[PDB]
A paper describes a structure:
WbbB, a lipopolysaccharide O-antigen synthesis enzyme from Raoultella terrigena, contains an N-terminal glycosyltransferase domain with a highly modified architecture that adds a terminal β-Kdo (3-deoxy-d-manno-oct-2-ulosonic acid) residue to the O-antigen saccharide, with retention of stereochemistry. WbbB’s two C-terminal GT domains produce a polymer with a [4)-α-Rhap-(1→3)-β-GlcpNAc-(1→] repeat unit, while the N-terminal domain of the protein contains a GT99 retaining β-Kdo transferase, referred to here as WbbBGT99. Kdo addition blocks further polymerization while creating the epitope recognized by the carbohydrate-binding module of the cognate ABC transporter, allowing export prior to ligation to lipid A-core in the periplasm. The evidence presented above strongly argues that WbbBGT99 is a retaining glycosyltransferase that uses a double-displacement mechanism analogous to that used by retaining glycoside hydrolases.
Capturing WbbBGT99 in complex with the CMP-β-Kdo donor is complicated by its instability. The density corresponding to the Kdo group is significantly weaker than that for the nucleotide but refinement of the structure using both CMP and CMP-β-Kdo results in 25% occupancy of CMP-β-Kdo in the active site, with atomic displacement parameters (ADPs; B-factors) similar to surrounding residues. In WbbBGT99, the CMP-β-Kdo density is not consistent with this conformation, with Kdo instead refining to the higher-energy skew-boat (OS3) conformation. The C1 carboxylate group forms hydrogen bonds with both the backbone and side chain amide of the invariant Gln228 from the QxxxD motif. In addition, O4 forms hydrogen bonds with Arg163, as well as the phosphate-linking oxygen, while O5 and O7 form a hydrogen bond but are otherwise facing the solvent channel. The exocyclic O8 hydroxyl group hydrogen bonds to both Glu158 and Asn179. In this conformation, Asn232(=Asp) packs against the edge of the carboxylate and the exposed ring of Kdo, but interacts only with aliphatic groups and makes no hydrogen bonds. Notably, both polar atoms are within van der Waals contact distance of the anomeric carbon (the closer is 3.8 Å away) and can be brought closer (to within 2.8 Å) by rotation around the Cβ–Cγ bond. The anomeric carbon is therefore completely buried in this conformation, precluding (absent a major reorganization of the active site) the acceptor approaching this atom as required for an SNi reaction.
Author numbering:
A (entry chain A), B (entry chain A): 1 to 379, 390 to 404
Amino acid sequence: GLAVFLPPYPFRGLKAPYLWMFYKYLHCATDSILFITGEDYLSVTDDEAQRARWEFDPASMASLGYELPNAQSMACHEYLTLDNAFYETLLSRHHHDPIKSFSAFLTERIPDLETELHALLDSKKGIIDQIDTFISICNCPSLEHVARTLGKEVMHIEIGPLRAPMYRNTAYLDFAGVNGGTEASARYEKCQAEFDIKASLGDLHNYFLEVLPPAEAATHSAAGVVLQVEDNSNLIAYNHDFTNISLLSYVRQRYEKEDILVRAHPGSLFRLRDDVFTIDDSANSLAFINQCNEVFTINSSVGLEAILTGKKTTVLGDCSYAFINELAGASATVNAAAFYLFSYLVPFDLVFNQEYLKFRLGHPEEREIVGKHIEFYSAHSLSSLINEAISLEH
Amino acid sequence: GLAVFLPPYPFRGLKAPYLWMFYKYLHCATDSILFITGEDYLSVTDDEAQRARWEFDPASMASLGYELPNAQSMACHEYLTLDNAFYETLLSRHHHDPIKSFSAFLTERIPDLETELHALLDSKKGIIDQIDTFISICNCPSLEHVARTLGKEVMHIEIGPLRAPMYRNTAYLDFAGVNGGTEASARYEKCQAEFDIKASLGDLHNYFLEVLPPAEAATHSAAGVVLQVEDNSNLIAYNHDFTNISLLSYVRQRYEKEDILVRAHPGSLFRLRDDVFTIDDSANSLAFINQCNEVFTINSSVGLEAILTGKKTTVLGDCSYAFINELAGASATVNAAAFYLFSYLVPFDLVFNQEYLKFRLGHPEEREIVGKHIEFYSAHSLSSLINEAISLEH
Ligand SMILES: Nc1ccn([C@@H]2O[C@H](COP(=O)(O)O[C@@]3(C(=O)O)C[C@@H](O)[C@@H](O)[C@@H]([C@H](O)CO)O3)[C@@H](O)[C@H]2O)c(=O)n1
Ligand SMILES: Nc1ccn([C@@H]2O[C@H](COP(=O)(O)O[C@@]3(C(=O)O)C[C@@H](O)[C@@H](O)[C@@H]([C@H](O)CO)O3)[C@@H](O)[C@H]2O)c(=O)n1
């Protein structure tokens, strides 16, 4: 079966922080799977002092394609629960800074964590052997080390950078790292010679757009700045020490403040005062981007959007799509982006689909991977698969 | 004379960033002083695309006690100007992050900076010998190293944590460090035995309050969180890696979100969304504090305010006043705070007064220092000086 790691540790101050993926796996489940999680994920469903959370909102539920589990839905599966005192103990080893503790959880081994994991995984006999792969929603070297000892692979799975309703839903699936430490550039390097895509970057973008585009390229700001959620894993671990405020100061070295348009992240706790910069108020990030000559970001999904619409983009942090931007030729960039969208990214629902997971677990050729994504999307060389997908969809 | 260091480097994206202190020294000047600064501080006065800055606002001018210089006012003094390409070069040595470059400027030696300083300081003969002390508005180990080579002391001078109109204006003056690396705790340790202050912490606070207090201790939040300006020197260098967002997550480990009251810094670029926490909207930080049972801060001036009003205070960064909070007994805390307010802090105008600077340059006894501050404030042992000041002022 699948071993799904949904750590309960409330680093950002929220209990059961990955509850939406717990509900998505639980909704889509054909076989039993092993949850490695925390008591919180199980009791939130009945605790009334938190039904104002967004994972219980029918608009988020419909958008991610899940319904709330019931007693029978829970009982198909096995559960292993981590405890809190390791969390308390972890905080005190990092000066009671929960954000530094999160950083450590994302980027270093924690021996106590590993022992707890090793203990739960043979808490009952037969558990270990039934495990076909681990799935983790974030990088976790404690788990990756545990997985090596046992001979298990680790699929790192997260919602993608293109999302409904603006786009088809996409998801990440990467054996090395999600967001940080990814293998997207190395997968492309192995197959770049098979890519001869007869489309522009804009045509790639249109294939994935599910809406009429805004499209008012008239009136502009020389520079657009993308802000991110301040304590997102991207901004804690893979940011190269850039923050929202040093990103703005980066931009202000280069442009006067009258030439800068700044878009706060809708999900951030913080908004911009209407004092110094021109604050964007577009209904969506695509219409924000189309108002800017160039775009500056740490590692937000919106940077990919800026690259697919042809904009000069500066990417200051590590991310899965950076390598696309770093290519020289215009054609080289198109081919790298097409591999990215059609083969690195996965149609969102497949990463919760157990047979597609078995497929990826056999490490098939890039042609097979691209042919299975396009089949899902549309419901013979690799280049002609994509070229025709583009040509027919249009 | 005085050698005043007002670095022109626009780390926070603002030219002539320390312009208000340049205008305060220029207004108060009796003798010629040597400015070590940048071309920007001189041309801003005539550049019309920046008279919207707050240093030209008659309300800031009246509050800090200065008027704008004229041609004659400038001509009393000598000027030495730093150049920009060292700044450009510094940025590229820190991944073009201006906030990391600022951190380095505040906490490490920069050899190129030192050579530039050494060059300007004997650009003309006789400059060096006329220098009686350097004054710097922030810590700068390049300058401190330069000062040691030449045999000069460095006064670190900044606006204090108590400010008009809520309080008498105060200023910092410290030979080792301002904000970071201060000597306040070590000055107190040398004289603690001379301190027997017959007053409460509240009476200390009242001596400095210049307004009727708000005073509505009825209705409360278990926890108040103080946010700071995100790219302030305090939050770049002396913060122990705490940020506004990890401070909130620190508080959320300890209290539910319904028990937390959060005050953004009025000067920050960012305000809080009205979604998750109760956002304070008091007219001033004192009325915010009086609504909270305990107060959490990195190293904001408001933490001192919380300590003078008797509140349980948590201080997560380095600051000049921390040592007061770390004391055990109630009496011990009063005495440490009285030394802090009456002898560590300086009445704001004296730190621009050239004869008072000569006084401090002779390193007089704490009794002399306290007697000169109280004389300024009111216009014989150390304990009876303060006890009577408190008793008469009331
Ligand atoms: N200034 C911004 C930033 C984002 N968005 C919108 O918010 C979405 C997410 O972009 P993000 O910038 O990539 O958001 C974060 C981030 O802040 O870095 C937080 C959260 O989405 C989380 O999903 C992580 C990664 O998905 C972690 O795996 O990424 C975009 O696709 C876009 O719809 C926006 O409109 N404006
Ligand atoms: N949440 C806050 C923070 C501050 N203040 C008010 O703003 C003032 C400054 O407090 P600060 O928190 O100490 O402000 C900063 C800071 O953000 O740390 C920025 C700026 O004042 C600068 O003066 C530095 C030091 O003065 C640097 O020497 O300190 C307080 O005295 C108080 O009037 C407030 O009302 N609410």
